[PDB]
Design a protein around this motif. Structure first.
Motif, PDB file in Angstrom:
ATOM      1  N   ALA C 108       0.830  -1.187   0.000  1.00  9.01           N
ATOM      2  CA  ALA C 108       0.000   0.000   0.000  1.00  9.01           C
ATOM      3  C   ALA C 108       0.851   1.217   0.000  1.00  9.01           C
ATOM      4  O   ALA C 108       2.030   1.163   0.362  1.00  9.01           O
ATOM      5  CB  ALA C 108      -0.902   0.007   1.209  1.00  9.01           C
ATOM      6  N   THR C 109       0.269   2.315  -0.476  1.00 10.55           N
ATOM      7  CA  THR C 109       0.909   3.631  -0.414  1.00 10.55           C
ATOM      8  C   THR C 109       0.163   4.421   0.664  1.00 10.55           C
ATOM      9  O   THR C 109      -0.888   3.989   1.155  1.00 10.55           O
ATOM     10  CB  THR C 109       0.800   4.418  -1.739  1.00 10.55           C
ATOM     11  N   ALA C 110       0.721   5.561   1.053  1.00  8.60           N
ATOM     12  CA  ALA C 110       0.078   6.378   2.076  1.00  8.60           C
ATOM     13  C   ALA C 110       0.365   7.819   1.829  1.00  8.60           C
ATOM     14  O   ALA C 110       1.435   8.169   1.324  1.00  8.60           O
ATOM     15  CB  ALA C 110       0.531   5.981   3.471  1.00  8.60           C
ATOM     16  N   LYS C 111      -0.604   8.663   2.151  1.00  3.59           N
ATOM     17  CA  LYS C 111      -0.389  10.102   2.122  1.00  3.59           C
ATOM     18  C   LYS C 111      -0.428  10.542   3.595  1.00  3.59           C
ATOM     19  O   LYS C 111      -1.479  10.459   4.256  1.00  3.59           O
ATOM     20  CB  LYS C 111      -1.503  10.783   1.292  1.00  3.59           C
TER      21      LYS C 111
ATOM     22  N   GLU D  55       8.770   0.948  -4.268  1.00  2.04           N
ATOM     23  CA  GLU D  55       7.974   1.948  -5.037  1.00  2.04           C
ATOM     24  C   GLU D  55       6.959   2.661  -4.135  1.00  2.04           C
ATOM     25  O   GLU D  55       6.779   3.863  -4.206  1.00  2.04           O
ATOM     26  CB  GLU D  55       7.296   1.287  -6.249  1.00  2.04           C
ATOM     27  N   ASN D  56       6.285   1.890  -3.301  1.00  2.00           N
ATOM     28  CA  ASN D  56       5.371   2.454  -2.303  1.00  2.00           C
ATOM     29  C   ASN D  56       6.039   3.503  -1.384  1.00  2.00           C
ATOM     30  O   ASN D  56       5.479   4.601  -1.147  1.00  2.00           O
ATOM     31  CB  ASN D  56       4.725   1.320  -1.504  1.00  2.00           C
ATOM     32  N   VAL D  57       7.243   3.180  -0.917  1.00  4.03           N
ATOM     33  CA  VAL D  57       8.004   4.098  -0.065  1.00  4.03           C
ATOM     34  C   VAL D  57       8.236   5.405  -0.799  1.00  4.03           C
ATOM     35  O   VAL D  57       7.968   6.500  -0.268  1.00  4.03           O
ATOM     36  CB  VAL D  57       9.379   3.457   0.381  1.00  4.03           C
ATOM     37  N   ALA D  58       8.784   5.292  -2.013  1.00  4.50           N
ATOM     38  CA  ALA D  58       9.139   6.467  -2.796  1.00  4.50           C
ATOM     39  C   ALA D  58       7.928   7.338  -3.140  1.00  4.50           C
ATOM     40  O   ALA D  58       8.056   8.550  -3.216  1.00  4.50           O
ATOM     41  CB  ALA D  58       9.890   6.074  -4.074  1.00  4.50           C
ATOM     42  N   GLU D  59       6.771   6.732  -3.347  1.00  2.00           N
ATOM     43  CA  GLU D  59       5.552   7.498  -3.626  1.00  2.00           C
ATOM     44  C   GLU D  59       4.918   8.082  -2.353  1.00  2.00           C
ATOM     45  O   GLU D  59       4.129   9.046  -2.428  1.00  2.00           O
ATOM     46  CB  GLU D  59       4.533   6.570  -4.282  1.00  2.00           C
ATOM     47  N   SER D  60       5.222   7.487  -1.194  1.00  2.00           N
ATOM     48  CA  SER D  60       4.508   7.872   0.038  1.00  2.00           C
ATOM     49  C   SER D  60       5.284   8.826   0.931  1.00  2.00           C
ATOM     50  O   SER D  60       4.674   9.680   1.562  1.00  2.00           O
ATOM     51  CB  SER D  60       4.118   6.646   0.871  1.00  2.00           C
ATOM     52  N   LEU D  61       6.609   8.671   1.021  1.00  2.00           N
ATOM     53  CA  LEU D  61       7.367   9.307   2.095  1.00  2.00           C
ATOM     54  C   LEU D  61       8.241  10.440   1.621  1.00  2.00           C
ATOM     55  O   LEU D  61       8.672  10.466   0.474  1.00  2.00           O
ATOM     56  CB  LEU D  61       8.248   8.261   2.847  1.00  2.00           C
ATOM     57  N   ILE D  95       8.247  -1.320   6.571  1.00  2.07           N
ATOM     58  CA  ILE D  95       8.380   0.088   6.916  1.00  2.07           C
ATOM     59  C   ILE D  95       6.984   0.756   6.758  1.00  2.07           C
ATOM     60  O   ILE D  95       6.224   0.407   5.868  1.00  2.07           O
ATOM     61  CB  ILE D  95       9.386   0.845   6.041  1.00  2.07           C
ATOM     62  N   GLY D  96       6.673   1.681   7.670  1.00  2.58           N
ATOM     63  CA  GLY D  96       5.462   2.504   7.574  1.00  2.58           C
ATOM     64  C   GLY D  96       5.671   3.824   8.291  1.00  2.58           C
ATOM     65  O   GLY D  96       6.470   3.904   9.257  1.00  2.58           O
ATOM     66  N   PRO D  97       4.928   4.851   7.863  1.00  2.25           N
ATOM     67  CA  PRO D  97       4.973   6.109   8.573  1.00  2.25           C
ATOM     68  C   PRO D  97       4.275   5.974   9.919  1.00  2.25           C
ATOM     69  O   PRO D  97       3.179   5.374  10.024  1.00  2.25           O
ATOM     70  CB  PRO D  97       4.240   7.094   7.603  1.00  2.25           C
ATOM     71  N   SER D  98       4.914   6.434  10.964  1.00  3.01           N
ATOM     72  CA  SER D  98       4.256   6.383  12.307  1.00  3.01           C
ATOM     73  C   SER D  98       3.053   7.340  12.387  1.00  3.01           C
ATOM     74  O   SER D  98       3.108   8.464  11.886  1.00  3.01           O
ATOM     75  CB  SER D  98       5.214   6.804  13.422  1.00  3.01           C
ATOM     76  N   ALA D 104      -2.778   9.481   8.257  1.00  2.00           N
ATOM     77  CA  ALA D 104      -2.399   9.175   6.893  1.00  2.00           C
ATOM     78  C   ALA D 104      -3.574   8.641   6.093  1.00  2.00           C
ATOM     79  O   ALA D 104      -4.446   7.930   6.625  1.00  2.00           O
ATOM     80  CB  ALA D 104      -1.218   8.156   6.869  1.00  2.00           C
ATOM     81  N   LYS D 105      -3.587   8.980   4.806  1.00  2.00           N
ATOM     82  CA  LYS D 105      -4.569   8.381   3.903  1.00  2.00           C
ATOM     83  C   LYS D 105      -3.918   7.128   3.308  1.00  2.00           C
ATOM     84  O   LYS D 105      -2.924   7.234   2.603  1.00  2.00           O
ATOM     85  CB  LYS D 105      -4.954   9.365   2.789  1.00  2.00           C
ATOM     86  N   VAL D 106      -4.477   5.959   3.613  1.00  2.00           N
ATOM     87  CA  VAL D 106      -3.913   4.700   3.166  1.00  2.00           C
ATOM     88  C   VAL D 106      -4.684   4.126   1.972  1.00  2.00           C
ATOM     89  O   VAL D 106      -5.881   3.864   2.072  1.00  2.00           O
ATOM     90  CB  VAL D 106      -3.867   3.668   4.321  1.00  2.00           C
TER      91      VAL D 106
END
Lengths: 115, 109, 115, 109
Positions: C108-111, D55-61, D95-98, D104-106
């Motif tokens: 998943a991606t996240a904003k 790819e998820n990391v690079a688009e999200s963080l 890995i995830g944003p705390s 966060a919008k998931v």
């Protein structure tokens, strides 16, 4: 494997309980009581955590030979859920499947003998 | 908010054992952890422990002993461009010989 | 403190349950289902571990705003034992007091929006 | 028998994002973890992650994002006497944003 691992430091609540299965495999179970230190920061006993631990075979025998009630130990392992008998109420319990265990040298010395 | 770690491996040498100015025991050692599955890539973590614990270690353990070590991971960098150098080490909270391949006589000193 | 810490990766079994105490403090509870992968090594679903988690205040509200049933999460926290009602049988349960939680970016991606 | 670690900290920069020969995504980043209690001593761990996750990391963080990272600690030494140099890094498993200080919008991509 993607297992949930843990390290727990604490004291055995009792002598390790040694048993052998039908196949002859040693199995040892014990409970680690871990007491955190928690105007009171790190200078008051917190509520204890009691985790039941399972260990098998040579490692189980090593533990039955070496550890006793009250021994301070360092335990690493994997968290496992185990599920009644004659009551109907079907309950789950979390336990540790031990990977490594050793007596802590914080308040004690040890004489190690390799297998 | 410390980053903690547990490492299982073998002492690369007999633990050091020294005393500081204040008369405080210090012990330095290195844990070599090597992940049948042949031999995986080794990790050598420099560790230190102090006081009674340090004395217990020095009296109990020898080179090759399999140990379970938990503590806080610390890091330093030595520099302005001179080629950065970085090192990590573990400030040990607890250490004991593993009973995976051994037994031990435990004496509360 | 000398607490027993854990990192658990898994999926929320349900939408986070949000509640406020008498003081107005937010409290959120949820269960993480962690399914290890275990002739079968890493290519067969193992028995799942279900750990109930508790989180408080702003972090609890952040979670109630962001996560839903089935979300893959990474959770760090401390293991706590909590103890009947109208049956007599006095039972203990192990839970996680959450320190940090986040949606995993594995699938998943996240904003992210900072407070 | 890998030595695993969990680290919580902030991305020192926007995550890199590259593609290898095989067309596989790779992302490199560094997590700065700094342990009220003033400011404790920082730990900067170099991390890498591959494929979709990368790819998820690079688009999200982005730089500064507070992240929770778990994975395997690896180590290398560059030498015969030339002044040993050692580095560690984390092969990231998850890995995830705390959500400690953020929402966060998931979106399941």
């Amino acid at each position: 494997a993607g297992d949930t691992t843990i390290t727990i430091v604490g004291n055995l609540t009792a002598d390790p309980e040694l048993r052998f299965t039908s196949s002859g495999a040693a199995v040892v179970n014990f409970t680690v009581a871990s007491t955190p230190r928690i105007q009171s920061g790190e200078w008051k006993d917190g509520e204890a955590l009691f985790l039941r631990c399972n260990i098998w075979r040579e490692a189980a025998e090593n533990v039955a030979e070496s550890l006793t009630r009250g021994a301070r130990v360092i335990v690493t392992g994997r968290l496992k859920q185990r599920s009644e008998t004659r009551e109907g109420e079907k309950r789950t319990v979390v336990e540790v499947e031990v990977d490594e265990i050793g007596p802590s040298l914080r308040y004690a010395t040890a004489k190690v003998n390799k297998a």
